[PDB]
Amino acid sequence: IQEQTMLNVADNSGARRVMCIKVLGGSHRRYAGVGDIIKITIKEAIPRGKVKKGDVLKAVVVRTKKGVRRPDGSVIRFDGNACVLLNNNSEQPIGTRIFGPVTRELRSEKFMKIISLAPEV
Amino acid sequence: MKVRASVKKLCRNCKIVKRDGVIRVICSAEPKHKQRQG
Amino acid sequence: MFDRYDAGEQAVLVHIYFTQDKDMEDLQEFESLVSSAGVEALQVITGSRKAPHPKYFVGEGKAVEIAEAVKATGASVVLFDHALSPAQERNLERLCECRVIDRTGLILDIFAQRARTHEGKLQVELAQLRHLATRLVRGWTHLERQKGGIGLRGPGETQLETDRRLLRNRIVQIQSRLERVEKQREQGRQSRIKADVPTVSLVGYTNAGKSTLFNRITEARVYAADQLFATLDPTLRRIDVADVGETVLADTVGFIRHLPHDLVAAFKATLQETRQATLLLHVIDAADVRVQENIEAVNTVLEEIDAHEIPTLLVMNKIDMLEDFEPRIDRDEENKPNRVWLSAQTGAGIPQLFQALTERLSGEVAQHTLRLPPQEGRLRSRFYQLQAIEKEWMEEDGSVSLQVRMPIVDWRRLCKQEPALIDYLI
Amino acid sequence: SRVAKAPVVVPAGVDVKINGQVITIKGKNGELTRTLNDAVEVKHADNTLTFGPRDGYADGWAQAGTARALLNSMVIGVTEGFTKKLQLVGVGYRAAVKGNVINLSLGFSHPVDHQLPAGITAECPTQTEIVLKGADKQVIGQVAADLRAYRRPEPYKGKGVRYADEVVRTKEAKKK
Amino acid sequence: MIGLVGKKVGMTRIFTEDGVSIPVTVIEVEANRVTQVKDLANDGYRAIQVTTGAKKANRVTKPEAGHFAKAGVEAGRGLWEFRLAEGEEFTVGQSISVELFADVKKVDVTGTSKGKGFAGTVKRWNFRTQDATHGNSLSHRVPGSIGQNQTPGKVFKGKKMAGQMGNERVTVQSLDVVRVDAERNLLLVKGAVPGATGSDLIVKPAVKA
RNA sequence: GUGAAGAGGGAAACAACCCAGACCGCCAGCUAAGGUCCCAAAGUCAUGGUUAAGUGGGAAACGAUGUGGGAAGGCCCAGACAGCCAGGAUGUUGGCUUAGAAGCAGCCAUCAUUUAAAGAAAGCGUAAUAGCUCACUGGUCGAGUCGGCCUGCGCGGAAGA
RNA sequence: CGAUGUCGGCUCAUCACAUCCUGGGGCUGAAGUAGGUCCCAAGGGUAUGGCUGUUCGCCAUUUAAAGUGGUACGCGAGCUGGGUUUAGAACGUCGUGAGACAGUUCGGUCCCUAUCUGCCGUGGGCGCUGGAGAACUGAGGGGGGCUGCUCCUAGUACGAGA
RNA sequence: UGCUGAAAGCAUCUAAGCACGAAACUUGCCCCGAGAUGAGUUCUCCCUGACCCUUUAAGGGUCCUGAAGGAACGUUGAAGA
């Protein structure tokens, strides 16, 4: 989340770590991100998926250090921050495969493609 | 329409009119002729 | 500072093709520049075989010579072909008296003497502006000498850097006015949204006869003469075509080698029509050996202005002089980026131009032989109403057969609006 | 001026009744007084409806002739009604009557309804048409167009309520 | 319609079956009684005064008690008002309470909010911090730029600065009722009430609904 | 010419404008420019005329059935002007164009007739053909009517910290 | 000139309306989609980053919008001291020179404890016609005002299609 | 954007007189608020003692009264420099 900030790619398709660059939506949303899509720059990569160095891309939060409220005083916290790369145009998961479990809180839209293709909530 | 400081007219059906202080004028050839605030 | 430098004065001309590698302008085409400029030509001083210098552009001795030539033959100005950096003009001035101008400011001067439409005014004076903004920069020196050298209390920013900002503000201002303009012509271009939008544009040097072909094809008033800038201002007139009937035309200004940078940047408005244009018709001269080069000249700017991705259609105009051939179709291929055999002032080559064109823009020639029984007055109606019956042949008991060829949008507006149980068209 | 001094003449069935500046106008079915008269000393006699400016007003024949035109409209009102053929056309459209509320259908999600102030009623020879009928000549047509007001008919196919017959603008630019 | 004077007794976390965990402030609603009625003849506005709570029956003063003489005496910690004329009510005190709302949906609620005493800017409002590095001498957290040079050569009266904060009346307009409870004079409302624990709240229904 | 080096009154506040050059007193009088419903000294003065805007109390080229004033000119009781009753003509759908053009795709001709009246045409319409309205006039109705010119005074143009 | 501290940033706003969006309308070369202008509108709201001392300008990605301009080019008795202009030194260059250069680079001290004003809180005195005690009414004043995006209407009106 | 409607026989959104019409306008919400020197409302509650001389909108003086209520101090506060 936020500006800069390292992110672990969640998907198989991504090539290792990348950094956030803009938070879509809002006049200019501050400390934002949990399912909201965000802009990305690849910084650290190997040939892998169709991802490449130097690119800018849309993406989604799926795992979060500050984590998520759940309706009962619940706060599901994680370690690191998983993220899934996306067309800046087509949106769409770019990934054949998610790694690591993620919350139900992200669902509907294409994300049901994600979470259905993503084991364990 | 416009607010052309000069007004004149644009057909034969055109006709100057007063409304309020303002000098309106209209046609029906095409409405676009509607001069006013001259 | 919208100020103009005059064309039409006595001039020591200096030029050097004789540089050895870039080459350029045998002189004569430059002389044409001089000509349409209306310059009072005097003499053609020329130097030798040099790479360009940090000095006075050309060599020391020759420079001294042109200096003296000025001082004696009394030229009103040292015209000096081939561009230089401002200091080069400076040091050159130290050896003279008069205004110097590179190839550029010449071209702007003549350009501006040609301005008539207000659009042309802004983009011109814009190019004038951007150009002069550079050159002014050394000129502080006098202004500085009178200034005292210390005592800038108040401002932190230095003067003339001030003036730099001034002309920046001018610049933005100019383009600012340019904005609503390109928007304007664009509002004209909303009509280009109607799906039925053939949109040609012509290209070539000045005296590529552009005015002429445009004339004969249009039966319209566009004057043409030997001079450069034989046209200015884009010019719309519609024309016939066998497969879209209406067909918008707009002449572009003619080209030269190495037309100015910032010119184009100001000129994008005028060419903004070219970009969208669905087909780059391109006339070329047939008398010059310059042929190849000019194409290479034209390609140059085409690059910088995009849309060189457009299909094109060459016309080796000026077949008169050559008796190159009878005018003909000249399928370069089935693709047709064709050469076309013209002499526009005679324009004898046209029918092949249109016909080849007729091949080159369409997308539905499945023709149909339509027919009706006494219920066709409405058919003949539609066909004359929109495009064309290809053939009208009445026949027995009011049954009447026809042939028609239209683009498909017609086919469905028709199939919809009319009952079209006549059903030959889809 | 013209009509302003033209006598109104009161028809026998109709019963004019001067009262101050205003004049009650009992009639065949109408019976009111739109009129109010700032200046002109309009007056009854045999049937004789006086006008001509009273004091000084300059509005004289203006207001006066206006008054005639009114009551003269009015008495014709107390005879009978006025504005009609308040048509609507184009596919999917329709209209209806009830009580005093009037149905209309114009592609809107919410149904189109407005209820007439009295002195006028209506009918539906078809949903395509609403005929109006009102005692007094002003309010009927005014509200009639005010009924049209919900949808000034669109140029490109004439859809939208069209007050009376009334040929309108009909351009065909930027189509297909 | 009308409100009542009850008080804060501790925010809690109520559950449904979903147990979504509605945050739930609880206001106790003690029975009231009507200190006086006013009408559009003696007073400008048809009205009902009331009270609730209790004094030490020595804590009371006679000028106070003499007002308490009429329409009986519940005693109380103070009075409260309700302007009304669409509605109608007794000179005699109510015994009514929570039932009044047992139907209702959005109570209003209004309170004093805990005093924060004198306080800094960036708290009376939300001024940003000026930077504390790269210099910023002597002013790491300071009132910003007021005034504006020559000009009308004076300083306006918007834009506060250091000053009072807290201990002040303020409504919250709309508030939903979680649950009326005839049980223990309880009354259950979502969100939270400005006003410190152990102090009263007015609670009239929705108005800006 | 005043000021500088000149005090008064007036133009709200005002060295340089209009009026007036203070030897000092006087709880006397009349005047100046300038003013006279109130602050506030005196006309709610007289009579005559205009302004409809708060012009006055910020301004132009320029626009216009603003309203005062003017000279002259046109039409008409053989009845016009406005509306209203009806006619709208035959050559000839002029020749050319062209699928079709013909009062209205054009083109150039556009006459001759009849009649009070009607153009081969002023506008609409049709693919085109054929409707639709005036120009034309009879009738109607009954006094005025249509303009240009000059001209006082007003509106429109006219947005700021 | 018996001293009025000067550019950029940084806290802070303030108005204008010559409109950046949102709001209301005229025409359109307004199918709808959308625009373009024009009118009316000042209620509120109106981009973080890269690069450079920068304002700009350029660039990357946004948002409905990245409006103008006034206000000792609002804001150094609030800060900032990077640019601006000292002495140090160097380069090119002009000078025979000492010396200079708006040609560039290195380094380089921001003072004032608030009487008055006006500002924010919060007080005490006296007033209000014997005296208190609580409850008031509203004479006036201020805060408050953005909006995306989704489905329903409905794949409808539009359009040949899209 | 209108209706009706004349002055100007027709017209005409205007002269008369009605219908509209917006983040703006004034309310509608909240807060403030009789120093609102126009100083207001309602409710409660209280004191209803004698004598003397001077000027009498006036007291002054004696004497005797002290009321509700106010505090002052102390216990302290999510109240507060």
Ligand SMILES: Nc1nc2c(ncn2[C@@H]2O[C@H](COP(=O)(O)OP(=O)(O)NP(=O)(O)O)[C@@H](O)[C@H]2O)c(=O)[nH]1
């Ligand atoms: N022999 C010959 N002369 C020609 C031909 N076309 C044009 N010319 C002549 O050469 C000149 C061309 O003028 P112009 O058409 O203006 O050239 P241009 O290319 O149009 N210039 P611009 O576009 O600036 O007008 C005229 O004299 C023209 O008559 C051609 O095909 N043959």
Ligand SMILES: [Mg+2]
């Ligand atoms: Mg040409």
